[PDB]
Design an enzyme around this catalytic site. Structure first.
Site, PDB file in Angstrom:
ATOM      1  N   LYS A  37       5.544   4.495  -5.191  1.00  0.00           N
ATOM      2  CA  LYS A  37       5.188   4.063  -3.834  1.00  0.00           C
ATOM      3  C   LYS A  37       4.794   2.588  -3.778  1.00  0.00           C
ATOM      4  CE  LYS A  37       3.327   8.603  -2.559  1.00  0.00           C
ATOM      5  NZ  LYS A  37       2.036   9.351  -2.558  1.00  0.00           N
ATOM      6  N   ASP A  47       6.047   9.644   2.076  1.00  0.00           N
ATOM      7  CA  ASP A  47       5.019   9.464   3.091  1.00  0.00           C
ATOM      8  C   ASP A  47       4.720  10.812   3.725  1.00  0.00           C
ATOM      9  OD1 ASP A  47       4.360   9.215   6.093  1.00  0.00           O
ATOM     10  OD2 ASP A  47       3.946   7.180   5.393  1.00  0.00           O
TER      11      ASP A  47
END
Ligand SMILES: [Cl-]
Length: 248
Positions: free
Chosen positions: A153, A185
């Site tokens: 990420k 996400d």
């Protein structure tokens, strides 16, 4: 996979109508992080230093002690007032004394120490190459340097912010690579289930191909879908289409 084809067809067309133009407007006018970068770039007058600081800063932009927009402005104001030379030393003082990124400092400083031998030698010519013709390569190389997954990420966030920094330093828009997949996400994952049981990375890859909007720019559009006043004031009549995405 179980898919609501009608809803997917509407999603694709709405994203086509918004397009890269809307994604860019959201990134530059709705996301206050962009103006924070403009301020720092103008105050440093050293684009090599500016871009390297943005990459290093993004790599420690996790588990913040404040909002992302506040953190990037604190970074921008701090390094405008206290411009750095030794990046590890600068962050060693900045992070524990900051308001918005004072958590997990030990691990963050280790990450800065790990990335600096890669960033420090880069010339502006090499940085230009990464921006105009190498953002996927930069993602892969950052992952290797940091000993992280290619899809990690914070690695992907560093490339996203690098794209902002290059747009500012080089006065040219280069779309994010199609090859950098949709970020992982929680809000995106719940939104995806409105349309399909298919894994989001595969789903949004096809959406990106069908719309011509690279996944990182789709992510920009989905931010206000999933601030609203700032969007209505900058995207014009295309702001209603953002509200259409939330109600799908
Ligand atoms: Cl990472």
């Amino acid at each position: 996979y179980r898919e609501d084809n009608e809803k997917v067809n509407r999603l694709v067309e709405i994203l086509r109508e918004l397009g890269l133009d809307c994604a860019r407007t959201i990134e530059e006018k709705v996301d206050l992080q962009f103006d924070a970068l403009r301020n720092l770039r103008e105050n440093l007058k050293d684009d090599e230093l500016f871009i390297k600081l943005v990459i290093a800063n993004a790599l420690v932009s996790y588990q913040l002690s404040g909002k992302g927009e506040d953190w990037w402005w604190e970074f921008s104001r701090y390094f405008s007032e206290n411009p750095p030379e030794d990046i590890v030393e600068a962050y060693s003082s900045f992070l524990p004394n900051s308001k918005t990124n004072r958590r997990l400092v030990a691990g963050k400083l280790k990450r800065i120490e790990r990335v600096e031998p890669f960033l420090s030698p880069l010339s502006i010519s090499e940085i230009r190459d990464y921006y105009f013709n190498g953002m996927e390569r930069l993602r892969d190389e950052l992952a290797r340097v940091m000993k992280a997954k290619r899809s990690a990420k914070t690695i992907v966030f560093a490339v996203k912010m690098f794209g902002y920094a290059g747009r500012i330093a080089f006065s040219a828009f280069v779309p994010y690579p199609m090859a950098i997949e949709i970020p992982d996400d929680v809000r995106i994952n719940a939104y995806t289930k409105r349309f399909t049981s298919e894994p989001p990375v595969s789903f949004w890859g096809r959406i990106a191909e069908e719309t011509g909007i690279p996944p990182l720019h789709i992510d920009s559009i989905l931010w206000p879908v999933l601030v609203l006043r700032r969007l209505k004031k900058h995207c014009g009549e295309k702001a209603e289409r953002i509200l259409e995405l939330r109600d799908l």
